[PDB]
Structures are given as C-alpha cells and as structure tokens.
Amino acid sequence: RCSILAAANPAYGRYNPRRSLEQNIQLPAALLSRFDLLWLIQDRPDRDNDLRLAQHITYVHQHSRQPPSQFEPLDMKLMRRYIAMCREKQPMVPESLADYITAAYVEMRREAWASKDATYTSARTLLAILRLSTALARLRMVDVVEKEDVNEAIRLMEMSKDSLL
Amino acid sequence: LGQKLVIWGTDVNVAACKENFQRFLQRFIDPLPLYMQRLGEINVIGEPFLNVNCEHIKSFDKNLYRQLISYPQEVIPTFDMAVNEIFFDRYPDSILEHQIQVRPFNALKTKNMRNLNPEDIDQLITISGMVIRTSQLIPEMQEAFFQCQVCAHTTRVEMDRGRIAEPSVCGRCHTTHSMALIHNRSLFSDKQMIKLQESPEDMPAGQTPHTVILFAHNDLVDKVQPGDRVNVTGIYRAVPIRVNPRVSNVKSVYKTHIDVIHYRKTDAKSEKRVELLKELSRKPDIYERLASALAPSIYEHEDIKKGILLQLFGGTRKDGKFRAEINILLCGDPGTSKSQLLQYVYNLVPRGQYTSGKGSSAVGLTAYVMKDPETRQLVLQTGALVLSDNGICCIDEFDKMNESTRSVLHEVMEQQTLSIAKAGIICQLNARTSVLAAANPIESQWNPKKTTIENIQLPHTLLSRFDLIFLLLDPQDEAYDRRLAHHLVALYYQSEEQAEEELLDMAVLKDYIAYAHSTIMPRLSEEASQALIEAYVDMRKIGSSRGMVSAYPRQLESLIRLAEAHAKVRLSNKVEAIDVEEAKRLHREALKQSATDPRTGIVDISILTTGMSATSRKR
DNA sequence: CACACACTCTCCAATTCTCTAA
DNA sequence: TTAGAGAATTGGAGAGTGTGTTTTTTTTTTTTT
Ligand SMILES: [Zn+2]
C-alpha cells in the first residue's frame, strides 16, 4: 500500500522535446497515466551554477561535510515529527468549492484543447488535483480544503507540464 | 454415573455444566425460547447441527462461557448431550441420521495468528483468515472391521485416540494372528486439511503473512474453498511429529492446528420479486431505465449501455447451430471507462469471467494441461472462454493477445466450442459465451485519421464476428465536459443513502436478468419477420446502387439476435417491429461509430477487408 | 559407526491331567 | 462323591539376532519470435 517515486531515463540518447514522451521513454501510457506529476528534470551547462555545484562537491570531498549554505534547514527528526503531525489530519473538501474545482478543471482541460492539440487528460486529472489539494490541506494542518489549496494543486500540475514542454 | 464426572484437572462438574446449558437453551430469548426455534428448524430441515453464539452464552452465564472456552474438548460434547437430550425429549419420533452437534462460535475474532501462544493449547479460539489451499477428502477410520481368514468369523473394534486394539486371536476358532482388517467393511468419516493465511487487512506493515493449518471433519469439510475469507472457531490443538516415518521418536517442538468447530464466511458480499418484475416490465421505457441503471459510476454512453444490456439478455437458443450469444467490442484510449464497464458487468452477471488478453493474465483464455502442484497429477484447466459457457466473458486489453489466442477466439466465436489436442486428451469443449471485449489503439491515443481496424490492429476476420462495435471518444466540447465534471464532483460527494439506492437498483437488475433467462423464450411474429427481411434488403440497397456492397447476410443474423434480446428485455415473448426497429437503430449507430471512414463515411467493406475502398484505389 | 523396530528361540512356571484319600 | 497331591504339557516373558536410516544451472532444441 505504497506510493511510487519513479525515475526514468530516455531509451536512447538525451531527452528530445521534438518527440512525444512515450517516444522518449519507451514506456506505455498505461504506466504513464497512473502518475500524478510527470516532471522533466532538465540539465543544461550553466557556468555559475556549475561552479557552485563543483565548489559544493569539492567541499564535501575535502571536509566530509555539507558546506555552510547560510540557510538553517529543519533537522530530519523534526521533519519526520512534523509530517506525522500533519498527516494525522484527515481534511474534507467543502461542497461550496465544487463549482470552483469544476471551473479550474474545465479551463485547464480547454487550454489543453486550444493550445496543445488536445493532449491527454481525463477524470483522474480532477481526482489527482483533489488528492493534491487535500495533501496540501494536510500539510497546512487544516481540516478544510480551500481556494489556495486548489490553486496550488492546479499550479503544481501546470508547472510540471511546463517542465515537460 | 454422570453426576460423579468432573473434567480432568478442572473441578468443573459435567452434569452441572449440562444442566446450565439446558436452561440456557430453554430460557435465552433476546438476540435483538430463541434456540428451541433453531431446534424446530433442525426438526423440519434435517441438518444435524446447532449454531450457538458464545456472546449469548456469556451474557446468560459468564461462568458457563469460561468453562466452554477453557475446556471445549469436554464441554462441547457435554453440550451435544444436552441438546440431543432436549431435542429427543421433544419431537419424540423424528428420525435423524446423526446426533446433533453443537457448534459454538464467536461473532468476531478473539485472537490473531501472530499472538497464538502455548497458553492457548486445547482452548477454544476464533481467528480471521484467508484460505490458501484445501486438500482432497481424507477418510478417517471410525470403527475397524476384522475378519478371521481361517473361519470367516468377524468382529468390530472401536478407535482409541487414533490406534486400533487389533484382536490377536479369534473367538469362534482360536487361531493366532488370523484376524485381518477388512478395509472396506470398516467405517469411515470425512476429514480435510485447510491452509489459512492471515488477512491482508490484518497483517502488520510490510511483513510476510503468517499461516495456520485447520482440520475440518464430517459436514464442515466441504464448506470452504480457496480464496475465501472466514472467521473460523475451533480448538487450538498441539500434536507431536515423528522424526521419520518408521520411528516413534518425536520432535520436542510440537506442530499446531485448529480443529474446526464452526465456519463463518465474511466476504460473501421468489414471488415477492416476480410480482415486482412483472409490472416493472410493462412500465414505460423500462429499456431506458435498465440501460441507465447499468454502471451508474461513469458518465453516460447510451448506445454502449444499451448494447451491453441486450448482450446480458441475449437471444433465444434453439435447434440449428445459430448462436444466441451477442458479441460486443469497445474501443478507445487507455484511461477511458471501458475497463470500469467490464469490471462492473463481471461483478453483475452470473457465470461471468474477467481476464486480460495479455499473456500475463491471471487466468488464461485458452485451455491447457498442467501438473497439479499439490498432487502432481494432470488437470485440464479449461480457459475463461470455456468457464463462461453460459455467461459473459470480459476480455480487457483485447488488442494485446498473441496470434494463437486470436485463433482460439476466432474458433470460439464461430463454432462456440474449443478443441483440445493436448497430449493424450482429445475433446470438444463447449464455449457458448458472449464475448465483451475492450481494445486499445496501438498508438498512445486514438488516431482520428486512421480507421478502427487500422488503429487497434486486429484481423478483419475476427472483427467481423462481433455483433456490435463502439467507441469511447470524448468530444472537445464544453457542453459535454462541464456536465461530466459536475457528475465527477457529485460522485465524490456520493453518500451511503445513494449507495444503498444504487445497490437496490443493481440487485433488481440482477433479478430481472435472471428471471428473463429463467423462462422467457421469444419467438418471431410475421410482421417482425417482414421487418427484418426488408431491413436486410434496405441495408443492401445503399451499396448495391453505385456498384459497391454495403451489407452481408450475417448482419441479418446480428439483427435477429438484437431483436430477440430486446423482446426479452420488455418481456414480450413475441418479437415485433418495435424490437426490430430498435435492433436496426442500435446496429446502425454501432456502424456509424465503428465503420466510418473519415473521408467517405460509413463503409461496410472496412469490416470485410483490411483498409477500405479508398485505400484499395489509392494503391 | 548406532539407535530404534522386527523376528525367532529358549526357558521358566503356571495350568491341566492322572491317581489317591477324605 | 469331592477334591487334593504329583507328573506332564502349554503359555508367554524375555533374551538374543538382524535390518534401515540423514529449488538451480548450463545446455540443447523446436517453436515462436
Ligand atoms: Zn477364526
């Protein structure tokens, strides 16, 4: 009863946006449609970012420790306790937000129609949006889903598709 | 003398326990004189057992419940004596094949497989689990029959805890070692081993499941099949195992099993129905009502649901060799509602099957021969098409099957039989099955430019056997998509008062279909005959003019099937022009969907051949 | 190898036959 | 007429002898790929 975090590579060579996703990865839509977010983790040469990455890795090598990033992330145990505290909640979506969820879903659908040759979407898209918004509600530790949760779920899906395109 | 008895090392008086259980039977009344009703039910039905609830025993008398749980091996025979004494004090001349068995049970599990301990040995327990295997019927000897091989004098010996007191000498004569066990004059009772896994819902996180052995006897043997989920009440036994079969040394670590006292299945889910169905059949637009009742959980495709309804009802089987079965094919992208339709109607129909055309399927479409692993003997596993010999066979991923399976399905659809040429075995199995198929495009999503056959890439010969073919394409239309989205959010906000209503609708749909199949046998009227005849000629007209061909005689057979099925739906028992018109309408709608070339419209030879007329002139 | 089963032979004494007295 | 003491036969306890045991990989071949 587990969530799958998959990482694929293209069948041959580098990724190529000229081709379709199933042509790039050589894995059928029966697999690809089960997922909720499809992300393209791109990598281009970029001089200053490469310099910083190399400085980071060289510090890791010569000191056996992460460099000072001048940010204080939460410790791993605190993150674990937080996620347990935030997933203990079981929010519910209010019925007044059904119309807004409908509007967001249909406009995303119709943008796919109008601008990207009706690329594949279905009712599981709406179900995935609702699951993402409820996960956001759990994360915010509020037992009612809201406009901001729906907006951020829609935004997350749209930016994942933007990474693909 | 019974009053002197106490259970060994227990200080409980058997006679007092018997009296307490007798007054329990006589005076317990409130599950909302209870068990005398069960005794009367035994008296009229003729089944020698009584089910009793341990919670009722507990609420009536806590001490009696404690005695039952702690010392079942003595207390349960005491309860048998009590119930038989009451039953034959009443009903004085009723005859039973056996004395009644009391079968105490707890409504829910008292323990789980992981927490069973040596403290629980020879104690009554209840556990939940899933059945993994069930052995063949084992005969257990109950009384040994001996005969003297010198003088044919016979004697009978009773079984002492699993061993025989063999007579060393004969009584009539006096020869030594002359008494021989006559196996088939001895007396036997049924026994069976069952291997039971802890439930998936009961396993701890990420652990491999635990398993126990149950032993059932007499009438509880043949009540449980593999895959069932049961709450089994029984006595937790511990027995020794000998180190090797020819030596009586035993391992210090004992084997354990459960002597089954009671089974309760926990995954199972007439005139009062006929009276409803008779008037509901003559209610107006009952056809539409049933078709809309099919698969409420998906947004509506009217002609697909109508075709599946007529497939469920089927034509009339008569004799010559013409199939009453109706074959339906669904096409569309992955992510459409076709698989939901398949799984729904598989859950609905009797004698149904659901499997994948892919070679990785759980149960195959074709028949095969295999070594039964728990026995090593050969078994002929007839495939799903043969198992669904009077039902619907749902085939998901129908495009992905290999050419041998395509040949098997061609054979089954044409001839309604499956040939067996296995090593040694030669036979003609029966496969009068209605195939409901769900295909996919070979590409990722449906190509609008290419035809149905060109997209799914199945042979035209096999495509020509299907009576109806439909498509689940969704328009790029707000008028459809907005209301679909409203239906989806409403489906999220589904509640139990709608679930019960839809379950009732599905249940009366099941009863309707079963009652139709039970007796209703349509025949053709003269007007219906004329309508079908002129329908075939009319379908031939549009193509025969201009020199092409637009129909062929097997489509008349399909129309006959659909008309008979529609008469079956409306309970007419006489096929009429109403049924024939509906058959023509639905068949032409299926053709409008499936046989439409994007350029020249509906082309009939796209089913008779690969490609179409335009392609044949393009090359 | 060595520790349980499986089988035969021998001796010991307990029962029945024979002859006598109560 | 019963039964009890001495002699012979049969039952069986037990001493002695002999028998049986404690999934895996590479390669081929036909059919199907
Ligand atoms: Zn004899």
Coordinates of N, CA and C in Angstrom, one line a residue, chain B residues 43 271 388 516:
Chain B
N43 N -35.5 -29.8 13.1 CA -36.5 -30.9 13.0 C -37.1 -30.9 11.6
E271 N -41.6 -15.2 -5.3 CA -42.8 -14.5 -5.7 C -42.8 -13.0 -5.4
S388 N -17.0 -19.7 -19.0 CA -18.1 -18.8 -19.1 C -19.1 -19.3 -20.2
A516 N -35.6 -13.2 -16.6 CA -35.7 -13.3 -18.1 C -35.1 -14.6 -18.6

